Design a protein around this nucleic acid. Structure first.
Ligand SMILES: [Mg+2]
Ligand SMILES: [Mg+2]
Ligand SMILES: [Mg+2]
Ligand SMILES: [Mg+2]
Ligand SMILES: [Mg+2]
Ligand SMILES: [Mg+2]
Ligand SMILES: [Mg+2]
Ligand SMILES: [Mg+2]
Ligand SMILES: [Mg+2]
Ligand SMILES: [Mg+2]
Ligand SMILES: [Mg+2]
Ligand SMILES: [Mg+2]
Ligand SMILES: [Mg+2]
Ligand SMILES: [Mg+2]
Ligand SMILES: [Mg+2]
Ligand SMILES: [Mg+2]
Ligand SMILES: [Mg+2]
Ligand SMILES: [Mg+2]
Ligand SMILES: [Mg+2]
Ligand SMILES: [Mg+2]
Ligand SMILES: [Mg+2]
Ligand SMILES: [Mg+2]
Ligand SMILES: [Mg+2]
Ligand SMILES: [Mg+2]
Ligand SMILES: [Mg+2]
Ligand SMILES: [Mg+2]
Ligand SMILES: [Mg+2]
Ligand SMILES: [Mg+2]
Ligand SMILES: [Mg+2]
Ligand SMILES: [Mg+2]
Ligand SMILES: [Mg+2]
Ligand SMILES: [Mg+2]
Ligand SMILES: [Mg+2]
Ligand SMILES: [Mg+2]
Ligand SMILES: [Mg+2]
Ligand SMILES: [Mg+2]
Ligand SMILES: [Mg+2]
Ligand SMILES: [Mg+2]
Lengths: 246, 203, 53, 38, 207
RNA sequence: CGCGACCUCAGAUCAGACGUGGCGACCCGCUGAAUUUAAGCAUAUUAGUCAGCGGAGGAAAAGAAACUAACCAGGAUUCCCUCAGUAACGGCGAGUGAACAGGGAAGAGCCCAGCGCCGAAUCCCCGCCCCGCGGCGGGGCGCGGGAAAUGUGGCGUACGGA
RNA sequence: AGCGGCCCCCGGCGCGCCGGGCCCGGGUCUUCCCGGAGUCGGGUUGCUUGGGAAUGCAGCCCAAAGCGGGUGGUAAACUCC
RNA sequence: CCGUCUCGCCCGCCGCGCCGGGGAGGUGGAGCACGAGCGCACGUGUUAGGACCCGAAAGAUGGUGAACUAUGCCUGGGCA
RNA sequence: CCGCGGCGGGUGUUGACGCGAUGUGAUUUCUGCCCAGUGCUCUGAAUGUCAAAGUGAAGAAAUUCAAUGAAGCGCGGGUAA
């Protein structure tokens, strides 16, 4: 049997990501003594933007208190950021947009973004075009804090990480239908290579288990168990329901 | 004096003393590299019963070897052939891990000639050893009349041809009814003497 | 390894020697073999021991 | 391929040291001495 | 595809045998090599015995062969402690010594000590320095008559005693041989049961 | 915070030494299949074989018993004849298949650790001189320096030994 | 052809000294000392061999002993050699 | 003569017994009943080996190719 | 998802308006009834069947017999774009 394409995207040869023009990793600022006892001032220098992927970045320049030098950084821009806006950053930080302050101190029901799942890893959650997490509760003993994610799920995070305040700028992107075809083509000429999907019934039976036959039909049930071999795991992966609920 | 009963200490391996000294030394050894030189042998008892005189020339390394069998280096399954020769998981290697350790520490330092090896510690996934190496051309080894047999060019790489005591077990030889099939030189010429036709002149 | 050589028994090798010595004494089986023996005075020709000198 | 060796072996080229070792062997690799000076 | 009546047989040639075939065309040019390396060995040691030092008299095992006497490896250390010879001189005068032999009998110990006493009286021993002997050396007479001994020294020969023709006793007419061989077979098979039923009767007779 | 000492560990275009790659007829160590036979075929056989990989030598390996036999007992290894196409294994089908004894070629045997005794009784290198030095060695001298009591030499090893 | 001749070269081994090195052996009797340890062996899984209730090798866990230990071709105990 | 079944009687002895030995009558055996083999050479016949010569479709180990064509990339060029 | 292998590698300089796996085929218009079957999933001591190990008894022992017994199949609910 020939190797189906799902058993062929895990090589790393032609399905790599186009990382030439990407201006840099949208990290956060690290931890130190100042971000644990006070705050520190940023001087946003421009809003240089990568529509390499579709979310706007931010150039934030900090005064570094160890050597005589100016550390640059990058962030993800919240909604309503100027050009020239004193972004503060720390734990004693006052509460408005652009500032970044720990999770344990902000009150309940505050719309945040770019949370750190662990008390320091420089930003890993809710950073896409137009999403926001909400802080649900707190707990003074055991030092934890609940939060609801934009999926719908909930999760417990220790109340020592950090988060910017405000939603991600770039919302409303899922509208304006791509009525053209090659305008999705110039979208996936960027990041990576998977766009012209060929359905499985059209294929021959040597590269897809569903295919083959005279009539375009499946024969086998599309729903498959998870404890399955690689290359059979092609259909609906696991089911709790399969239908018409709206 | 002591060497008679350091010997009898180093077979209290279940006791609380040696369960401490190994629950320490295996950790110390685990943060080091895979093949490094120690200046003196951890066991002098066992070291002297193999030929380690404490003079100039003799060197002692210390190497780690990972553990387990050997599964066959094929793609996914796909061992083409009859269904006897499908087996990939549960195969077992013929030579021991002790003469793996000897020839890993016998090829990396090619200017030396291996004498023997011994045991030190064990983890879940690691077996440690010690080795003894000899300078062939140093004047102290050279002018000894007893042990200038090494410098002869015959005894190059004793460990690749299988001559150490760790490979002598793998060859399968001795005397008796238990060792029929290595009469002659080895296992091969015990095959060659048999599966040939001696065609005489007159017959 | 074609079988080159042969072996013959012992007591046939000695019977052929006795049957080749018994016919170097007749003056007919020597003339008919081809030699020139018209004049030799005695067929088992025995000469003195000073020829080894 | 026992044919691709004999395209590239020892008996092919010059042997610019082996042919004067095959000559020096038969006198036990003498050095130093000379024929008698006359 | 066998025909009417021939024997069944299994030839062992299904393997590739033409690759490993040992010819023997060497043979009449190796009996000459061994003949030269044996005669140039026989002229290196000019008055010594050519056939190795003398070798002991030993029976043979395995009831098929237990009525012969053949050569051995070397003398033991009882056959040298009794004969009064030190065990590392005997290596230097041509006496084979192996330390791995027992002596469970006596009648071969004696005939070995006697054979040593023969060889010690045949042995011509040269002086170290041909100007000065020892107490036990030999005279300048025998040196001129010293020569080699080709062949195995004091060859081991199987001798048999003889007996003449006796007159038959009146007794041996009444000796039944076969009902004694089949009594010793029955008595040699019933040694455990006969000695066990008597024990069971000694456990039963306490009542 | 000092001068100090053993330990563990690095750097050098430090002094003097070494190994690395080739040939691959014979050799030792691993790895190792399928055609083919069975009138099919999957255990078997083809085979511990070709290919593949790493090491040597003028020869390599083996080797002085944790041995064979139940005899009135032999007595290191290798090599030829023999046992033998035999005891045995095996869809008990096709087929694979040893050794001991006996006669012969060759003949050779040994040392350390431990146990203990002799005042480290031990080596290697640097220095000066004399002899010889196209295989770098011997004797004399070095208040000249280094390694070894985590054990250097002598006697001594299962045939008993001191 | 021939124990025929001549001219060179390197050795094998025999003898004189001149040098240094090493002072060691038997037998008979009294008193002392004497041996190799994650290995033997046991269970198990896998390849193997003519080796068949498992010849060898290798892997995992368990793990010894001094009138003791292994072998003594059918597994198992008690025995004697 | 050996193997095996049926009927039933006497004898032996350092060991006295679940010891040992003997008879008549049918049945199974590649056996005796005054030898016929051993070693060599030649011939046919059946077989195992490449096996009267030529002939496949395939199967396995180990290696060489994206200078044509298939797709993603970098860098440049062209469309009255 | 790759891979003989490790703290290995791509997706990922990524984070649910995001990755990945499928069936239909513009818009307008509608998309019916059936969960018994084959699949899929969830409650499982609500339990019939269920290895090795570790446990008990009888034996001189090798052994033999009993209790207990994970997943999954069985039984019970959900699901037809
Ligand atoms: Mg088509
Ligand atoms: Mg398929
Ligand atoms: Mg249909
Ligand atoms: Mg098969
Ligand atoms: Mg060995
Ligand atoms: Mg026919
Ligand atoms: Mg240098
Ligand atoms: Mg195999
Ligand atoms: Mg077939
Ligand atoms: Mg056919
Ligand atoms: Mg077929
Ligand atoms: Mg075979
Ligand atoms: Mg096989
Ligand atoms: Mg193999
Ligand atoms: Mg090969
Ligand atoms: Mg090489
Ligand atoms: Mg050479
Ligand atoms: Mg050798
Ligand atoms: Mg050897
Ligand atoms: Mg011995
Ligand atoms: Mg033997
Ligand atoms: Mg026969
Ligand atoms: Mg059958
Ligand atoms: Mg024999
Ligand atoms: Mg001889
Ligand atoms: Mg010594
Ligand atoms: Mg000592
Ligand atoms: Mg087999
Ligand atoms: Mg092993
Ligand atoms: Mg038995
Ligand atoms: Mg017994
Ligand atoms: Mg016929
Ligand atoms: Mg033919
Ligand atoms: Mg096939
Ligand atoms: Mg190109
Ligand atoms: Mg493309
Ligand atoms: Mg659909
Ligand atoms: Mg249904």
């Amino acid at each position: 049997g020939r190797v189906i394409r799902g058993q062929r995207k895990g090589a790393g040869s032609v399905f790599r990501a186009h990382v030439k023009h990407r201006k840099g990793a949208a990290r956060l600022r690290a931890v130190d003594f100042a971000e644990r006892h006070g705050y520190i001032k940023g001087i946003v220098k421009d809003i240089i933007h990568d529509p390499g992927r579709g979310a706007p970045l931010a150039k934030v320049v900090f005064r570094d208190p160890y050597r005589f030098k100016k550390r640059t950084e990058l962030f993800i821009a919240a909604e309503g950021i100027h050009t020239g806006q004193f972004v503060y950053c720390g734990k004693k930080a006052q509460l408005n947009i652009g500032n970044v302050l720990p999770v344990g101190t902000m009150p309940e029901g505050t719309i945040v973004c770019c949370l750190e799942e662990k008390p320091g890893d420089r930003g890993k959650l809710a950073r896409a075009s137009g999403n926001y997490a909400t802080v649900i509760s707190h707990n003074p003993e055991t030092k934890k804090t609940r939060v609801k994610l934009p999926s719908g799920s909930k999760k417990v995070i220790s109340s020592a990480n950090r988060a910017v305040v405000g939603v991600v700028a770039g919302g409303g992107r899922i509208d304006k239908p791509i009525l053209k075809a090659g305008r999705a083509y110039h979208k996936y000429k960027a990041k990576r290579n998977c766009w012209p999907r060929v359905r499985g019934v059209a294929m021959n039976p040597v590269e897809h288990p569903f295919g083959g036959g005279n009539h375009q039909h499946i024969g086998k049930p599309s729903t498959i168990r998870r404890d399955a071999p690689a290359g059979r795991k092609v259909g609906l992966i696991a089911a709790r329901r399969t239908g018409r609920l709206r | 004096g002591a060497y008679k009963y350091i010997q009898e200490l180093w077979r209290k391996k279940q006791s609380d003393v040696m369960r401490f000294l190994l629950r320490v030394r295996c950790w110390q050894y685990r943060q080091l590299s895979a093949l490094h030189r120690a200046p003196r042998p951890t066991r002098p008892d066992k070291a002297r019963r193999l030929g380690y005189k404490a003079k100039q020339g003799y060197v002692i390394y210390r190497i780690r070897v990972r553990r387990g069998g050997r599964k066959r280096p094929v793609p996914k399954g796909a061992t083409y052939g009859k269904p006897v020769h499908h087996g990939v998981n549960q195969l077992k290697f013929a030579r021991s891990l002790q003469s793996v350790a000897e020839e890993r520490a016998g090829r990396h330092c090619g200017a030396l000639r291996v004498l023997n090896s011994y045991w030190v510690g064990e983890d879940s996934t690691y077996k440690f050893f010690e080795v003894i190496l000899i300078d062939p051309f140093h004047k102290a080894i050279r002018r000894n009349p007893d042990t200038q047999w090494i410098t002869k060019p015959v005894h190059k790489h004793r460990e690749m041809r299988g001559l150490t005591s760790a490979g002598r077990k793998s060859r399968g030889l001795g005397k008796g009814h238990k060792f029929h099939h290595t009469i002659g030189g080895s296992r091969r010429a015990a095959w060659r003497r048999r599966n040939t036709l001696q065609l005489h002149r007159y017959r | 390894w074609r079988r080159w050589h042969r072996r013959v028994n012992t007591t046939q090798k000695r019977y052929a020697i006795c049957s080749a010595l018994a016919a170097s004494a007749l003056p007919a089986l020597v003339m008919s073999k081809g030699h020139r023996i018209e004049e030799v005075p005695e067929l088992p020709l025995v000469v003195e021991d000073k020829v080894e000198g | 391929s026992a044919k691709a060796k004999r395209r590239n072996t020892t008996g092919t080229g010059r042997m610019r040291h082996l042919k004067i070792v095959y000559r020096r062997f038969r006198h036990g690799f003498r050095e130093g001495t000379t024929p008698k000076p006359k | 595809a066998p025909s009417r009546n021939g024997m069944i047989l299994k030839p062992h040639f299904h393997k590739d045998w033409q690759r490993r075939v040992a010819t023997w065309f060497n043979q009449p040019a190796r009996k000459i090599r061994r003949r030269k390396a044996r005669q140039a060995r026989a002229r290196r040691i000019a008055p010594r015995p050519a056939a190795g030092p003398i070798r002991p008299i030993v029976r043979c095992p395995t009831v098929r062969y237990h009525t012969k006497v053949r050569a051995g490896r070397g003398f033991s250390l009882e056959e040298l402690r009794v004969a009064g010879i030190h065990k590392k001189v005997a290596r230097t005068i041509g006496i084979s010594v192996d330390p791995r032999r027992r002596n469970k009998s006596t009648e071969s110990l004696q005939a070995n000590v006697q054979r040593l006493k023969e060889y010690r009286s045949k042995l011509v021993l040269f002086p170290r320095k041909p100007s000065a002997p020892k107490k036990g050396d030999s005279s300048a007479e025998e040196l001129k008559l010293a020569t080699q001994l080709t062949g195995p020294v004091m060859p081991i020969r199987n001798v048999f005693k003889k007996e003449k023709a006796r007159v038959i006793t009146e007794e041996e007419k009444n000796f039944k041989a076969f009902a004694s061989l089949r009594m010793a077979r029955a008595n040699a098979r019933l040694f455990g049961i006969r000695a066990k039923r008597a024990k069971e009767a000694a456990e039963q007779d306490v009542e």
